[PDB]
């Protein structure tokens, strides 16, 4: 009703601008943004701003306007923030005030040129000697999911989302710097693979027409990264997007940004210290402090993370459990059923134990926590432990009740890797469509030999969630997946 | 072959290492890499190295060995380069030399701990007080396509490809640094879109199971990035991978790295000077000079690039052309046929002129050259010129006979964009499967209004080709697409 009246009115105004000339001038140039004028002239008296004649030009969206009849006050908005404009009838060229400015609408992109002063409240404002219309907005300035469908409106309105994504950029940059300072080289491994691997999930399938070849979207860079380690890049990492067919969730998006790093001649303890130093560095550089407020909790990243094994977490958060039930398939299956887990025919003992850990523990790990000693069945790419060959040297890394990152001592054994891939093929035959495939090339690389290597990966979106006080992954991803 | 016999021999050795204990020790740590020891102690004679007892430990692949019977010489290779080891029988623990060292094979991953000295030739060497086998290579040390299929072998053998990809990493880092210094914010936009756009090519199609939605792989970030410029991020860029269904060519890969930047309140001339400053800066920082040797040519990036229009290039590289034939559909179609272009029913006049430019000109542009004044038919997202509504303000930027990047003043007109989208849908209906789709959401964003904006994009792989003296894109991409 009233919205379509605005649409017709503004549309007819744009058409009138077409009538008389150029309605889309691209020639306007600005020498300043609001955040710069604030970061410089915020604390200066109107006496110093009057003696120094400082002319600036800015451009942005017109957010608010108050017309007082030959003097008007405008709120202008650009990347850095808001700056205030003083629009005077007799301080502009003839007719600009009455025949142009007063006919503009909120949301139109304009630009202004004037001298700096401060109002009676001490606010920095630009007395306008020139004002003109760069673009005419056809819709006026702006349920809970509409923020995610049209993110431009969310960015225009709420500054919390703006700060969230700016913080995301700053965090990514700080991560690249923290990795480079330690001697790691950032690479680009294929995003489209013939054989997907490196994790367990449903891959996306597409078709390459020129080669008539069905290819999968990457579920993990892992195998190609370790191939590059065989090549002799012994400190390597990739921060890039992986694709999984799983589905939408608060913690899940079909395409997400992940970091995977690998350093030779190290084990997973080095990656524990590397993780703690990573979060301490991002906490100090990105925000203010090692103490980060998240929801109803406070994370202290100057404090070492809590370390537990998987069985220690199961027994910790379910003390009534008999730990002998985890040494037998039938008792473990009965236990998992008692929790409410639906067991699959393809599941072995280790998988049942791990799922029991998922239902019992994961939701209770709030403070940052490392979970170690995973079974070999659910860790096909991880190095076997020396004392207990049925478990691998591995850890998953949890913050705020969700898995953040994953790291392990990589398995450089060729025959063992091939055999566990065989097990994964058997599992895929048994109905588990998240199971990996058999990759013969990676086995060949391991036969050319892979130095003892540790490797880590971290879902970046989860991390930025933790640092922005954002409780949904949709708040931290610019254009997440929707449900039409 | 004799290769398989040695392979079985190494496998038997590895099994013997399983028999007597741990065959995959991960506990060895190194405090130095070869490039560090070279960057420090290369300038010191054996007199200074004798007074200072400097003990270092290194680890890496054993490339060469000469066993002289209680004295041996080993070349060790790691990330930073090669370093030489002096393995003495009586300088190691008992049995290490005879029962272990002499049984190792070339390519095995080892580690050494010793004191620094210089041989009679001045070579920096590590006298080994300890040596042990970290990983046992099951296959011995290694043109055509083998380099591309197995890249660990290429990186192990050829030191040229190594520093090719290292130069790639350093270039990418320098590009992010060069963009951040100018106020651009790096951004992540979807890799999977419901409606692909921003370019013309066959997209990859896949299926999301949870949403029962068929989705396309990104052919360009453009639409989402400009959406974010509407949101108020007025300097944005994305360096990330785009997917197109094309084929394997010298200049083509199905998945390739792209940079797309957008700055509001600017036109394409600002992007021309931005590009020249970009290549001059990268050339000075990475290669130490403005003059870059590529093949048989020398590019000078301290020199401004050559500027031509499209018709000026058609007439320059085909002077017998009558430029009136490009103003009429039948004359232009007959002309393109005379060149050998196969015209399609969906092609209009501007398309014919652009394809004539491609056949006549592109292969002849060796020195960096800007080509301006593109027709609106092949530039649906570009702002129309003021004097000639049938052409748009746009340029494509060529080096070494290939296209590198393209940039234009973006089209902020909503109705015009809608109409050009309509024409692209008509083109798809007319048989052209590279034509775009109709994106209603982007039109909606343009109706919320997009400030006057200029935008650019650059194939990164082509650029790294120019800076590595690589004449195929396969040399500059770690794992390119192969033919099974
Ligand atoms: N489709 C779904 N819908 C609803 N609930 C689901 C779900 N899938 C799992 N869950 C929940 O998770 C619990 C246990 O299932 P898991 O499969 O073990 O947990 P996960 O969160 O999916 O981590 P995963 O192990 O699979 O990824 P990876 O380390 O290889 O990779 C390393 C890092 O990558 C990140 N990551 C993985 N998948 C991601 C995704 N779709 N989106 C964003 N980040 C992701 C993670 O931070 C991870 O740490 C379940 O009980 C369930 O509640
Ligand atoms: N599959 C094929 N096989 C054999 N010959 C072929 C071929 N395709 C084209 N050719 C030859 O090239 C000539 C001209 O064709 P064009 O289509 O005009 O040249 P192009 O290299 O394909 O640039 P394009 O137009 O597609 O990219 P865009 O501006 O959107 O902007 C994207 C930017 O990113 C880069 N880029 C685009 N696609 C890329 C890819 N697969 N790999 C690496 N970089 C790519 C580019 O620098 C580009 O500027 C043809 O006559 C033909 O001889
Ligand atoms: Ca999962
Ligand atoms: Ca898990
Ligand atoms: Ca995991
Ligand atoms: Ca193309
Ligand atoms: Ca073209
Ligand atoms: Ca092009």
UniProtKB/Swiss-Prot annotation, chains A, B:
One of its GO terms (biological process) is cellular response to heat. The keyword Nucleotide-binding applies. It is found in: Cytoplasm. Its cofactor is Mg(2+). The keyword Plastid does not apply. GO terms for cellular component: cytoplasm; cytosol; membrane. GO terms for molecular function: ATP binding; ligase activity; lysine-tRNA ligase activity; magnesium ion binding; protein homodimerization activity; tRNA binding. It comes from the Bacteria. Its main location: cytoplasm. CDD domains: LysRS_core, LysRS_N. InterPro entries: Aa-tRNA-synt_II, aa-tRNA-synth_II, aa-tRNA-synth_II/BPL/LPL, Lys-tRNA-ligase_II, Lys-tRNA-ligase_II_bac/euk, Lys-tRNA-ligase_II_N, Lys-tRNA-synth_II_C, NA-bd_OB-fold. Pfam families: tRNA-synt_2, tRNA_anti-codon. Mg(2+) 1 binds at residues 396, 403. Its EC number is 6.1.1.6. It catalyses: tRNA(Lys) + L-lysine + ATP = L-lysyl-tRNA(Lys) + AMP + diphosphate. The modification N6-acetyllysine is found at residue 102. Can also synthesize a number of adenyl dinucleotides (in particular AppppA). These dinucleotides have been proposed to act as modulators of the heat-shock response and stress response. Belongs to the class-II aminoacyl-tRNA synthetase family. Homodimer. There are two lysyl-tRNA ligases in E.coli: lysS is expressed constitutively, while lysU is heat inducible. This is Lysine--tRNA ligase, heat inducible. It comes from Escherichia coli (strain K12).
